[PDB]
Amino acid sequence: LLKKEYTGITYISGPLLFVENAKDLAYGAIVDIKDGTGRVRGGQVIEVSEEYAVIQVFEETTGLDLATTSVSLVEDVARLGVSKEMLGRRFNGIGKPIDGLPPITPEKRLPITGLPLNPVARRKPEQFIQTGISTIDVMNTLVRGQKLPIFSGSGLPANEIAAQIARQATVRPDLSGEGEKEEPFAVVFAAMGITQRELSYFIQEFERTGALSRSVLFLNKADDPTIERILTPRMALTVAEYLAFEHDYHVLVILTDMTNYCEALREIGAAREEIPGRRGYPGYMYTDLATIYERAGVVEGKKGSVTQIPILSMPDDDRTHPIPDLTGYITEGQIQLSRELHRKGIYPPIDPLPSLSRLMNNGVGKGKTREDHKQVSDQLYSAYANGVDIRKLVAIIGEDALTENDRRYLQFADAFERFFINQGQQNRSIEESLQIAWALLSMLPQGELKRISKDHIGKYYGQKLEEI
Amino acid sequence: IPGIRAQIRFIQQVLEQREREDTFRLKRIKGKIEAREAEEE
Amino acid sequence: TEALLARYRERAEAEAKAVREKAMARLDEAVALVLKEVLP
Amino acid sequence: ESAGELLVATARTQARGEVLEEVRRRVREALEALPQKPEWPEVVRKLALEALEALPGAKALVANPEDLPHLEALARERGVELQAEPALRLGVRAVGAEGKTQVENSLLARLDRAWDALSSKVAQALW
Amino acid sequence: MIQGVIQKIAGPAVIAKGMLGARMYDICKVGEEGLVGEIIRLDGDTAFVQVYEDTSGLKVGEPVVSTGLPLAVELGPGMLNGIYDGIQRPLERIREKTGIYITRGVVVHALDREKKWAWTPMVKPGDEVRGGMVLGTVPEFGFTHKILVPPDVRGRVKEVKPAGEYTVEEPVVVLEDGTELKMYHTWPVRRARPVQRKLDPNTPFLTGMRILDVLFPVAMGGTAAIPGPFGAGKSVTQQSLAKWSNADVVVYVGCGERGNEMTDVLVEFPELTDPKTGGPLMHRTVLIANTSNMPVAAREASIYVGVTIAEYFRDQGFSVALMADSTSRWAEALREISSRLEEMPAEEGYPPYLAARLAAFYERAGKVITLGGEEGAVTIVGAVSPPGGDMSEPVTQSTLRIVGAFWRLDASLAFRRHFPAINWNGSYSLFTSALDPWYRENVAEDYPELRDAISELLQREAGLQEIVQLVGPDALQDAERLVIEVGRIIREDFLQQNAYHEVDAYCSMKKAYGIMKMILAFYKEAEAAIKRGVSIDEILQLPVLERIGRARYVSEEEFPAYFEEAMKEIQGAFKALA
Ligand SMILES: Nc1ncnc2c1ncn2[C@@H]1O[C@H](COP(=O)(O)OP(=O)(O)OP(=O)(O)O)[C@@H](O)[C@H]1O
């Protein structure tokens, strides 16, 4: 293929430059900008007309001039280039390897934006994922094909929870009872706006337990060019969906911090002078986030699946901030961390009252898990809410008015927060979590467990304290 | 106190949004007057 | 129990040698294919 | 204890990378050795005729001093002006009618543009 | 036809030149792939076209052609049991032609041209016809689909096809002027279909949910808005309405929402049964799906296509319920298009004409006398998604000025898993007064007084709860403590409703009436007992409270006897206490 060079640069200011005689440049094409010193920059065509084409420069425009600079076409659509050997490798935000190993050989080249899934082609998510955390596995169960974000704050340990979930994720095919072979499982881990300290932490965490052997890492640092932060989730999702829908993998995708992505999007949009939104964020932010989140799911007639767990920090713990608010309108629930539990030293500090999983009711039950999962989850929620109400009542009018049942709920709440939630670094199984849940359910009278049916009581109402 | 603080920050956000809208309008009108005085030639 | 890695190191070296000796005998055909695909 | 498999995989990957680097060196030598072969005068003619037709209108044609003797004839046949450049090597370059657009057809650029596409094919055929 | 070339490309907007003679709001085909677009501005010899598809990869100079016609839908047999995209393309055909991914540039007819229908004429040669008159009938999944004359056609019948099987393209009736009438016709989505007259709504729209059907009713042909933050339950409520309402035909518009919610309907509805008639529920429903990652400009087209199909099914003589999943996404598309035009925004970036668009959309609902001389109705329920739950947002305020009912959802109730989670203090309804005669005739003579008593009890509980929160329950007398307990019973045993339970998902009007009567009877007896010096703590321990709380889980068949038994137990319990 030949190479075309456009030299009619007529205007440069900020991140934009105009090429006048470039009618052949398609809309959205990727271009290479070369200056007099031979350095090459990247760019994208954001608007093309008969008079000129407008190109947004990926890096800074320092060193460019109207005399020696030239523009060349790379490709019409941004392609990644993927292979099944990417497992165990480590890449930056733009896809280049950063682990020192040689680059891969592409089996195929795929557009990074993707295409929407036909709703007729989808199917309902049906199977659960064992994250190894009781508060998630029992009360907010994750389902293969779901979008389930985690809402955190400033000092809360989101990174540790993400690393633990990445290490401990399994599918548990035995509980399905079908006896099928264990399906391949992989983790795609995309990091945006990460500092060197967190980068080293993640690298060491992945290399400590050998989880890197089944993982693909996309790492974008805070000092990298801004455009690379935008493309990182799209690279990760392209790799994930390629693996899932061409090799029958069950892929789990983790996005470390969507707040940095939103800040990068705001900066890039404001560079082009779009109409501002609620807090300066672009008005099309909902669509932009949807084009990322909507790519997860399961397809009829295929074995693979894509699951997404976005992680984001709520600014000032304000749940009404545009980022968490727009994220909630797209996903199928949320896992919310609590500062009170963090002060109490509980880890992971997941607050079950404001958390919810919308697809949970279809992913658990007989054949999917143990047959008492739904009822014990409901009973746990009811009892914990009652205990929290007792706590709120005590802190105003005094403890002396408490009935025996009220103080029983009061102590059950403390036992719950101390044993069920505060698991530390343990990789609890689903059966272990159910056993613990029943153990502290037996702390209440048998007739008080109103949500649970009589048949599961007695079979599991062992009247035994925890063995841990 | 927390309710008053939430009200205060809500009002501050509304005022900042209105100021941003006014700035956008000012930039628009300046761009258009420049465009008029230029393209009139 | 600390001497495990030596056998895997030598096996990796043997595997690399096998791969490169497999590659050496066929480099010319690949080069001819590249020259045929690039040249007009 | 499973790090041995990691070492084996890394060794295999590095060996494959070295093999591809050797193939690249061989291809580079074969391409740079072209000026000594009889197909070379026809190759430069093909590149010139492709370059002069990629641009809808060519103001002038820039050619390497050693390449213009083999293409002066169709330089006059196409009706475009001929210009020399000692810096241009392994191909010819054309200039658009308005002077803004120029197209390059050197073999080195073609190799750079096509190797990332044919690497998978050469790996599949070789192994 | 007018034919030009692309001059400029910028996002979902394309400027074509050489289009002198093109008309406003006509449909144009942009580029080599023929992407569908619409003209929204004319200037010089140029036209401004908004593209309903992805514009990536287009080049300046590609041809642009104008079809000369506005955006329109095909109305005829074959719409029920189907699912369509933003511009009415069958998604199943698109799947079978292009795989699991939705690619642009696919052309396929809205109505299947190969299926044959049992045509039965009703008009005779020589008859004078007019717009909206019935020419014949066609079986449609157990419905009697009526072939209607287009609204602006007049003439005398010259020839009628006999009974038999024909495709939708068959000219079944020919007029004396040469006009051929087929089984289908086209209609511009931006023009409201004419009617003879609009009537006053006097019959209820039974949603099957106790709180909405009782406290804030909506009448047939009315309009309701359901705003709420994320996770409040708009989609679950709308699906419950689509599954249990007494409408003849349900039209669901997925304007910019998730794709899993659209897949859930396709998977589940073919297995459920229509409450009004045997056969699967999916034979009753038409889906218009344009998900979040599908092209933005197609949301407005989705809304207009849905409302036009609802109008057509109304014109056939049915009662149609129209649900719009989110109008905020449509407002977002309007804002984006206005931003591409460089117009002056009004507030929060929305174009100044948003309120006019919303009013024009909502005004298509109503109970009417059709052009054919029979009754029909369209009921519109539109959900809103205010940013951060702010009710001062422009879309919500503009919607509240034209709708007759306001079903406000509360995040505080949703975060405690109290569903359906309507804030009964912020909600209202304007149809409650006009529906009283129907309630008296069909439910019970004294039903409105019972509903008023329930509302008064809820108000008293609300007015006592802040005192409870301030001084504590221990300092309160027996009367207000009984009021608080009765309010709690009402909130947790009457207002609460599980949309996933087999029995509790649906509730008849008589069941709600029975529950309310039981609650009021218990309240009266408990008040009398308190006046007789009985301790309220003793009242709370009575075993009949469990019977009252368990009432909503009793099946419809078994409820009438359960109600009598519960009333006898309620009177006996305080009778025995003395
Ligand atoms: N009536 C109900 N009965 C039982 N559960 C309910 C009910 N309404 C809502 N829920 C629960 O709350 C969740 C939120 O409901 P839903 O998906 O309809 O919310 P929404 O208001 O449409 O949200 P979004 O704005 O994010 O689309 C449901 O997935 C379900 O788990």
Ligand SMILES: [Mg+2]
């Ligand atoms: Mg919804």
